[PDB]
C-alpha cells in the first residue's frame, strides 16, 4: 500500500496539481486583471451610442469601486468616469481605425503626443505636515546643495542648437524626499522664468546642457500660477513640454533615424 494513493489511479499530488492551476488562474483572471482596469476604463469606441443600456462585458471586466481617503482631506474613487474634455489639435491621417493622428498646430504648445499632460488636480503636492512639497531654495532656506556637487545657480543653460538660452536662478527641491526635481532659469530676452525637470538637464561644472528643445522654444514653456509653488497639473504641463521636444523640436526628430 501507498501513502498518497486514492482509488482508480488517482493520488493526492495529482489533485493538488489541478488545484494549484485553479488558484493561479482565479487570482490572475478574476482579481489582478480587474485591478488592472481601475484606470482608463470603460474603453472608448468610434462613438458608444447606446446611452440606454451598458454592454455586458464592460460591466463584467470592472472591479467594485474602491475609495482612497486622501491624507489632507478629500476622497478619490476608482474606477470612475473621466472623459478627456479639452479639444485636441490633432487630425486623423486616414480612415483606418488605428491610423495615427497628426498635429494640426504647434504640438508643444498644443500639448499633444509626447507633449501631452494628464488632467491632474490643480493642487499643490503636500508634505506629511501640510506644507508645499516642491519649493525653490529661496523658500526652502534650511535646504542646501550637498558639499561636493555643482551649485548650478549662476550657470548658463545651453539648448540643443548650442545657443545660451538663460541662467539658472534657483533649484526646486522635494521637501518630502530631499531630492532636487527642477531647476529654475530666467529665459534670456524674455523677462520671465521657466522650470526645467532635472532629468532633462546635463549638469556640467560651467554650464547646463539641455538637448530636448531649441533655445527659442524656451519662450513657451508653460508658466506657473504662483512664483513659489507648483500644482500637480503644472508639474505635468512643464515636464511634458520638454518631452514633446524629443520628437518635435525639429522636423527631423519625428521621421525615421534610418
Amino acid at each position: 500500500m501507498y501513502h498518497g494513493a486514492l482509488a482508480q489511479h488517482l493520488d493526492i499530488a495529482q489533485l493538488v496539481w489541478y488545484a494549484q492551476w485553479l488558484v493561479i488562474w482565479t487570482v490572475v483572471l478574476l482579481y489582478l486583471r480587474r485591478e488592472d482596469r481601475r484606470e482608463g476604463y470603460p474603453l472608448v469606441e468610434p462613438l458608444g451610442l447606446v446611452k440606454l443600456a451598458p454592454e455586458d462585458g464592460q460591466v463584467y471586466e470592472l472591479p467594485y469601486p474602491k475609495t482612497f481617503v486622501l491624507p489632507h482631506g478629500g476622497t478619490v474613487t476608482v474606477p470612475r468616469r473621466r472623459p478627456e474634455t479639452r479639444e485636441l489639435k490633432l487630425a486623423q491621417t486616414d480612415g483606418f481605425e488605428g491610423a495615427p493622428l497628426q498635429p494640426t498646430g504647434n504640438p508643444l504648445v498644443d500639448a499633444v503626443g509626447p507633449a501631452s499632460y494628464a488632467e491632474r488636480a490643480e493642487v499643490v503636492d503636500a508634505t506629511v505636515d501640510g506644507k508645499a512639497k516642491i519649493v525653490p531654495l529661496r523658500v526652502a532656506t534650511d535646504f542646501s546643495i550637498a558639499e561636493g556637487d555643482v551649485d548650478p545657480r549662476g550657470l548658463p543653460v545651453v539648448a540643443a542648437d548650442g545657443v545660451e538660452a538663460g541662467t539658472v536662478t534657483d533649484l526646486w527641491v522635494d521637501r518630502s524626499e530631499h531630492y532636487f526635481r527642477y531647476l529654475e532659469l530666467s529665459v534670456a530676452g524674455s523677462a520671465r522664468t521657466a522650470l526645467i525637470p532635472l532629468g532633462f538637464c546635463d549638469v556640467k561644472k560651467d554650464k547646463i546642457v539641455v538637448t530636448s528643445i531649441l533655445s527659442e522654444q524656451f519662450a513657451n514653456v508653460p508658466r506657473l500660477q504662483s512664483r513659489d509653488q507648483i500644482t500637480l497639473r503644472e508639474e505635468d504641463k512643464v515636464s511634458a513640454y520638454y518631452a514633446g521636444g524629443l520628437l518635435y523640436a525639429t522636423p527631423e526628430r519625428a521621421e525615421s533615424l534610418l
Binding site: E39, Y41, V44, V112, L258
Partner: protein
C-alpha cells in the same frame, strides 16, 4: 478600442525604419516595421516547430523535444531531422527577440519616454546567446546548446550541471543565484511597501513618501528611496544573467574539472595548507 486617456498619445512618428509605412496600430498593438519582422519570425519559427514536432514520436506537449545535432557535426549545418530544425528555429528565435526589442524602442520614442525597458530586455536576449551561440562557438559544436522542449530543456540543465560534479560551487552561479533570491525578495518588499501606504485598510487615510522611508529606517535603519528602489531593482534583476553568464561561459572553455575543486585557489594556499 482606446483607453479613456489614450487618444492624445496616438500620434505619428518615432519609428526607426520605414516612416509612415508601418506607423499604425492593430487593436491595442502598435505595429511598426519590427512588429512586421517579429510576426514574420514568429510565424516561421512556430511553423518549423510544428513541422519538426510532427516528424517526432509524440504530441504530448510535456514530451516534445526539438534537439540540436550530434557533436560530430561541429559548427556546420546538420540534416533537418537530426539538428537542422533546431538550427532553423534558433535563428527565428533570435529574429523574433531582436525584433521585439527594436519594436519597444519605437514605442518608447513615440511616447517620449526613456529607452530603459528595451535596454533591460537586452539582458535576457544576451543570456540566450550565451547559452545557444557563444558557448557552443567556444566549444566547437552547436551540439552543446540546449534543446527546445518543456521538460527536455531541464534534462540538459541537469546534465550540464553534473558535468562539473556540483554546479552549486560555480562562483558565477553563486553570484547569479544570490541576485535571483534578493531580487524576488526586494520585489516583495517594494510591492508590499507601496500597497501598504496606499491601502492601510479600515477607512484609514493613505500615507506619504515620508511614511515609506520612515518604515524602512525604523526596521532596518536605512531607506534607499522611491526613485532609487526602481534603479536597484533593474540592477538586481539584470545581474542575475550579467554575472551568471561568466559562470556559464567559464564551464568548458575555461574550466574542465569539478567546480568544488576550483576553490583550491583558496584552500591550497601554502601559508595555511
Amino acid at each position: 478600442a482606446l483607453l479613456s486617456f489614450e487618444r492624445k498619445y496616438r500620434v505619428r512618428g518615432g519609428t526607426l525604419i520605414g516612416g509612415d509605412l508601418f506607423d499604425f496600430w492593430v487593436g491595442p498593438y502598435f505595429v511598426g516595421f519590427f512588429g512586421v519582422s517579429a510576426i514574420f519570425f514568429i510565424f516561421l519559427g512556430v511553423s518549423l516547430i510544428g513541422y519538426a514536432a510532427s516528424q517526432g514520436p509524440t504530441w504530448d506537449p510535456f514530451a516534445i523535444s526539438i534537439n540540436p545535432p550530434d557533436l560530430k557535426y561541429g559548427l556546420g549545418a546538420a540534416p533537418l531531422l537530426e539538428g537542422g530544425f533546431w538550427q532553423a528555429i534558433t535563428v527565428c528565435a533570435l529574429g523574433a527577440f531582436i525584433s521585439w526589442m527594436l519594436r519597444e524602442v519605437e514605442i518608447s520614442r513615440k511616447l517620449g519616454i526613456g529607452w530603459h525597458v528595451p535596454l533591460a530586455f537586452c539582458v535576457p536576449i544576451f543570456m540566450f546567446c550565451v547559452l545557444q551561440v557563444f558557448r557552443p562557438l567556444l566549444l566547437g559544436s552547436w551540439g552543446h546548446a540546449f534543446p527546445y522542449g518543456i521538460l527536455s530543456h531541464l534534462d540538459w540543465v541537469n546534465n550540464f550541471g553534473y558535468q562539473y560534479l556540483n554546479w552549486h560551487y560555480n562562483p558565477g552561479h553563486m553570484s547569479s543565484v544570490s541576485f535571483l533570491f534578493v531580487n524576488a525578495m526586494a520585489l516583495g518588499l517594494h510591492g508590499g511597501l507601496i500597497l501598504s501606504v496606499a491601502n492601510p485598510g479600515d477607512g484609514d487615510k493613505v500615507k506619504t513618501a515620508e511614511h515609506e522611508n520612515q518604515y524602512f529606517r525604523d526596521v532596518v535603519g536605512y531607506s534607499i528611496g522611491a526613485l532609487s528602489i526602481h534603479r536597484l531593482g533593474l540592477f538586481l534583476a539584470s545581474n542575475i544573467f550579467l554575472t551568471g553568464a561568466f559562470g556559464t561561459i567559464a564551464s568548458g572553455p575555461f574550466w574542465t574539472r569539478g567546480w568544488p575543486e576550483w576553490w583550491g585557489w583558496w584552500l591550497d594556499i601554502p601559508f595555511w595548507s
